[PDB]
Amino acid sequence: GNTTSSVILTNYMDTQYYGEIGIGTPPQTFKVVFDTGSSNVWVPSSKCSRLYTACVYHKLFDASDSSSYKHNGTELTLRYSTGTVSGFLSQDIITVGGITVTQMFGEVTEMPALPFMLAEFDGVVGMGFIEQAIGRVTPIFDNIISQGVLKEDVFSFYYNRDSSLGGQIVLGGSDPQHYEGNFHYINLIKTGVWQIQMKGVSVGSSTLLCEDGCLALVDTGASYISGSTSSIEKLMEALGAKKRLFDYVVKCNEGPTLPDISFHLGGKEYTLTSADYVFQESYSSKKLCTLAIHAMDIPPPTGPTWALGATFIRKFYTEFDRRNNRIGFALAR
Amino acid sequence: GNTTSSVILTNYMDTQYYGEIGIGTPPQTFKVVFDTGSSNVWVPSSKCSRLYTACVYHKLFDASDSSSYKHNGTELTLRYSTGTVSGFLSQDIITVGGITVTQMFGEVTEMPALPFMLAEFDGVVGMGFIEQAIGRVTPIFDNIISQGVLKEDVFSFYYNRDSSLGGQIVLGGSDPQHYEGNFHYINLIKTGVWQIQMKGVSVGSSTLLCEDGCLALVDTGASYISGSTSSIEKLMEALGAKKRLFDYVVKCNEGPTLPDISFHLGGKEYTLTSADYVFQESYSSKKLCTLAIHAMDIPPPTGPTWALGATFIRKFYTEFDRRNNRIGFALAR
Amino acid sequence: GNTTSSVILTNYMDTQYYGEIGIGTPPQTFKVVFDTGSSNVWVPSSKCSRLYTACVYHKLFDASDSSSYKHNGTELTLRYSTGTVSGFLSQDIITVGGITVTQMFGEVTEMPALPFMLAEFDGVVGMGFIEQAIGRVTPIFDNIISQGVLKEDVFSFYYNRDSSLGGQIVLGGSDPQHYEGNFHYINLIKTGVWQIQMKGVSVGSSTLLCEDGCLALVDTGASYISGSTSSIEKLMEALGAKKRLFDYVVKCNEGPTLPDISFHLGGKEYTLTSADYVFQESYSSKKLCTLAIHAMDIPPPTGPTWALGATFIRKFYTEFDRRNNRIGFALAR
Amino acid sequence: NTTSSVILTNYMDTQYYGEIGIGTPPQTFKVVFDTGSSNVWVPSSKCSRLYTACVYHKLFDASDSSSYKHNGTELTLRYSTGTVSGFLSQDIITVGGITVTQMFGEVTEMPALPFMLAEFDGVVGMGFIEQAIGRVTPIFDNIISQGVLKEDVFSFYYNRDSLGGQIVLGGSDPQHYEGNFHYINLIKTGVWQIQMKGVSVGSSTLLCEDGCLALVDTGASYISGSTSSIEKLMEALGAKKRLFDYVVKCNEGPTLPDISFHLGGKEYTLTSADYVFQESYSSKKLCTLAIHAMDIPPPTGPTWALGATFIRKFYTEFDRRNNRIGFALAR
Amino acid sequence: NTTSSVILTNYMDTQYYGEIGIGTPPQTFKVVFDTGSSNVWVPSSKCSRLYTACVYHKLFDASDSSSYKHNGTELTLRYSTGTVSGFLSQDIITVGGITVTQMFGEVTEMPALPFMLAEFDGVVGMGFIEQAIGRVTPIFDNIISQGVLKEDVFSFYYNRDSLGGQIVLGGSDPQHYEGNFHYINLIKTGVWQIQMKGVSVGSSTLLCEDGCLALVDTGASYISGSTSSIEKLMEALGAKKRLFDYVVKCNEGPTLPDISFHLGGKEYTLTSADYVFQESYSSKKLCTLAIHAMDIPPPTGPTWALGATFIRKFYTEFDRRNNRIGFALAR
Amino acid sequence: NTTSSVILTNYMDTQYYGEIGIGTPPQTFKVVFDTGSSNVWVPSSKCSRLYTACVYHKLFDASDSSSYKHNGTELTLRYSTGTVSGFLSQDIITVGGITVTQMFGEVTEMPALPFMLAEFDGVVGMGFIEQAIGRVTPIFDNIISQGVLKEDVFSFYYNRDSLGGQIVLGGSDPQHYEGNFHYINLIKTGVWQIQMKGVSVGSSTLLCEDGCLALVDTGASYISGSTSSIEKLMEALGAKKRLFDYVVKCNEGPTLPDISFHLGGKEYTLTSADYVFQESYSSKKLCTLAIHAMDIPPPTGPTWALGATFIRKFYTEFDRRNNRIGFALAR
């Protein structure tokens, strides 16, 4: 085909990156994370009870104010690394980046506050495959590629650092104005899932971990780079950080000195320098700085897997290949 | 009539201002915000489940320990700017400031933690009109004025700054020992709602906003001065603050220098100096100070409306006129 | 008998102290607080909905993966000082410290986020008596003592300060390598509850409170030393601290100077020096330090009672006597 | 039967200002109320934006004001740290809830220093006419003639680093002091100065035995002394001049003497607390004291001037009937 | 049709470094890019762990690198604060997305001081060959011969205390400046120095009337001057040398002059903001300024050197075609 | 078969005290345990509240104590920073879990300075009898005669800025050291001092070549030296005396030498870390060092005294059988 498109995203604390789509005719405008870690679309409903406080706080979809809605009704529960949202299915037209498709998505009427009361975004747009789509509902990407319109079955992400542009996706391509050198692709391990083989993690200078090959899910809808508790713990122990309940942290004087960590994907080595991983808002002996790596256990559906989220993409411009099933990396500029 | 009365309130972080009432015979004592932004009375129930953690944390009303209770039973759901509480109706005698009335109020059995786990008060006393009373239940004020007892159908609020007196309401009047100059009244725009016409907001020195007339609900039960997201955003942009999810904030060195904001109500101009709006607990280049203005969207029931809460009353002693439907302002001393 | 045993615990912020047990055959491993303030065992279920976010975050018990489970099914709701958990009963073998017993415990399917989203532990092991066991379910201790195996019907706690060993329980005894001088016992006030008579609290140098005898529940599963709001308030007022919603706090320069507080239990006096009570992470005029005493109201089941939690045990190694119903104290080393 | 309080801002314990409206409808500005002078001045639009000080502070815009009443007589106002020069004009200034018509000055020349540091825009003098530059009738005098206040008095309260302070024109507010005041009489009308009979550092009358003068200034931050008496004192405090400011070590703070200003026949005492600025107790850091030398000139000065430092201590009441000053403990 | 940006780290506004890979597969290190020199050096495994500086920093390990190409000619590199000594070797260094083969040095002797304070491991010179120690062809020259860049240019952007900075080798990135540049021409090829025609503190050309030299160094943190001209300036700022560094009081910050570097026929101005390090506005504390004397030696030096301080101000473009430097406001 | 540890508080790394009970039922107070002296003293009710130091600290109230046993012989206790004067009395003091009867002093005259800075109430000497003022049998000697301890030994552990420290009377706790100790022998019984054979700043034996003395004081915060040797050292550290305390710049911290105390034939080394107080790495701020001159008098002093600074380093064991001191790395 020959259309190319991008949505443009907003970067929030480097921890949450959202763009906009419009459901419905008159469009309802919601803010959303474009997630390769799942395959479903949902936004909050008007039918959600406001005794859930997150629904008091995000925009809701009213469909009886939509000329193009179309009733469905099956229940659908989404489980994620880190919260469930439950709700029901519906269809209407959704506009992502000037491309309009009629997508089947979920209207959530149960929206847990933790974490969702802390989300600046409204829902989620899974960029995943049919395979991981609860309810076996076609996903936006597969639908846009039906439309015969893109010049390539590729979408790419640019995540920026923070305080113009917060990020950018491009559908049907890759803006070469935000990467350099070449791209390097790792073919998908099974398919119907963005999982890649990962050959080893070096902290400093040696394979402390990942050592006989592991899995690396490349996930845009994740903020941190994470691994199992068990190798998280270990990496942690090296680097020298404590546990504060949900994140590790180092004293900030120590900060600009943690070694580099490396990620060995296809004969290349993705290294992250200490600043790319620590959230330095001090350099002070008395104050705690947390790092951008975490523990997360994702179950055998697909995990155990290391997940490479924002930490990572923010350094390496990523393009996700459909035509060919693989992922490629190149250096963000 | 010729009684005058006041409750005396406690000021919490300048963000939450509560007094005490007693329901029931033997009184049960609950702490409450006196709210002109709504018209209903509710307190938590004993019948509330303690799996809602806010009910584990506030006092509950047991009515089978009340000689004067009187069964009702309709359900009633309260929606507010910022949380829902749901529950059922009941009647008992309520004592506000030495005046005893038998009021129909709600027993809440669903109490959302966010925000209510952070409330120092137990419930709410709407000071609003029958009109905005869910369930079309008479409100305390209308009942006290039935009692034939006040010398005037007026109540007034004094909110203090913080660390004696945290505030004070006076029923049937106004203590002139806490205002100066004269009062200035703005008549109520429609009636059955404390809404007034508001002619323009100046940040600095020019009408950046409110410009062709807007609405200003004067609300005692609100802590911040707020407007729609859309003009909030804009004011914000001027003044120079960021967004931290729920509030804006400025670096504190910048702090004692944000310009003044003005509120144009009836040919007078309500100005707030920078200190009246910023919560300065630092003056430091490295630390964030949040401001006392926020975004809040209140729906067409009554909003879009700017809401003038504590920020505002704390500077201008406010009296709310019943006899004559209007609001008057005077300078708190 | 002649076995003695200890579990070893982890100390988290001096505020939460957990050890490990294994339910089920293959063991499922959960982390738990050993609580003398209650008498029931529970851990989270797999059957818990993940729309409760605390269940997404703690390990769950699957029993259909347990060869030795045994179905029960009665509902059981646990109310505590500070949250409810609700769930259902089950039996399987539980291993505490190398001792294996088959215990009837609860599988929680409702787990409130606040507080449980902030708990590093998974459930609880009540060390209390049959008497306070909801559902009149035998407790682990009574079962282990059935097993005929301990040399004494005693368990003891060592809580450590913080950043080797975080703590230690010993079943059937007391490690003399962690106390000094002698032990001193206060016999249990009624029995079927760890409550002791408490003769007076001195702040500084005089009985400000507790003065005509009061109750002191000795509770390991509590972090702070607390009393009723009403005498908390008062003690507070002396010492000189404010209220921040849930804790009091003092300015930290003031910090290393609050007087000592004394606890008069059986002709001895338990004194706590200012550092044992304040959480000093500054000494600065501009910053707030909170203290390790709180208000808590526990209802007439057993309260009003002062509760002596971690604050206290951390200074005085405590042994709880079964054989003889009493409690003894000795100085932790 | 009136009284008018005005609420004050405290910026760092070093400046306390509050607000006024000049004009109709009123143009509002941050003013410092001083017992130090007698003239009212706010910055002017006619102020060149060449002066940063004028670029960054609010300007009075005269025709945006209906009561404006031209005068243009040129004024220079030399304080004891700062000349600003400008021109006389007229209007209504509303202070508290009072509404007065006064002659104020519109400044058009502001020094960056000291003023790019002031956080308020101007100054309101609570001083006599004798000290006014232009013998321009000041605002308390003008006010005291409307007949409305309840007393020819005006007090001050200033907080420690909440409120900030308050002026109560017309009387006092008891909510802020403890005790009953003691007055100490005006050494001569014209200036808010009294006679002080000995500054006793620590234990024994060290300095100023044998009287001297203390002006009482609501518009200064420190307790000032002349350079050398300051030297003598400090030498005694055990502090040393660092670079700028004298210093003592955090630790050392709590161990310092008390100074007591013998005055009026009663000894007014302050402590280490009271005069030292404790951003720490760190033996590892240095602490500033809130007492600074200030040599001011021959009629007024040479004199001690009891500033925010002393006022933070004792609530003050300036009294015009009796041309006396009272002091009670501030609370 | 290329360009290559490299992203920079800012440590305290005092050092900005970014990364490089030496080797195959590439061994990556934190480098400072300097207009100050012309040689590339990273620490060596052969560095004795006797030198802390070598114990704590990353070492180049040559046989862990297939392209390694021995040379061993001994180098000493004397900068204007720091000699490090080492030996010549070969390899491929990849910078941005470029991939070059260069002769770099493996240092084996590092001074603790200054280096146990550097946070990056080495240095990359963007200076001429004439200034290279060994007349060793530098990395921009080597690069400019692959034919790939889009222009014989390389610019710098450095943030205030987020990104940090960027080099854009080959051209400029507009996203970071406002305006159109003005060049000011190389006083003679060989060094990145220009002629400056007057440093005017505050209002009137105080110093350097009558030209002088300013080297433009991407690798220095401050604006340096010689000792006494620094003295003269500061004397004028009203600062005083404390112990180490000159100081001014927080308060006093915002009141200081502006310095403007007259150069190229255009006046390049900085302010108080621009040159003072404001960890406070506290009248109760002292503030460092980001301008420091630096006497450097006779051919190069004596000269002014416009460091991170000036670069933070004006985005820079070093231009090799035209052997000129451009400046636009940084944004 | 006993041992008795006592848990210590660390206030700023500058004081470590712990608790004692004097009386029946025991009246408990914060004491510093010193190897510096030999007498036990807590403040007295009979202390006049004229002395702030006595107003703010806990007082021993003798008849609130059944074992009280009057004596009234007047004591003055002159330390090397502080005389306090008082009177001898009797009672039972319980320390750890031991319960001893001793003669302590009830102080009635406390100096504000140094004491309005102490945070504990008194002092417990772990020194010999020879050094006791009154030749009053000290608490370790009295204790060592109940027959109960396991060894004529008592050690110390002090944390970096959690626990704080511990004394273990009777023996050592391995949980806090690594390694096996090495003793270095008492230059003469009477005092806890040894002979030190050279203080080598940085690399070469700079000072004290040719022996000198080091008292080992559990009750001092720093490593002290005499004034001029301190001068010589520091001069070498590159620090300068600021006002009070010597200073070095944050940045500069990590670059400083190591000092190593040659003693006992083994070299006891500390580093920059070890002796510098790093409230920052800011090149923008100044840092204090934990080594301070302290000229103490002719028999005892002149001598070096290895304080909290050195003890924080090496865990210490004072040994009375063998009248020797051991040191192992603290952990």
Ligand SMILES: CCCCNC(=O)[C@H](C)C[C@H](O)[C@@H](N)CC(C)(C)CC(=O)N1C[C@H](C(=O)OC)Cc2ccccc21
């Ligand atoms: C059932 C389909 C999902 C199965 N798989 C997963 O859940 C995978 C492994 C995780 C899934 O992609 C995650 N990243 C998507 C979510 C939305 C749950 C991530 C997530 O919760 N967030 C990511 C947002 C984000 O990181 O943007 C980059 C940040 C955030 C803020 C507040 C609440 C949630 C939230």
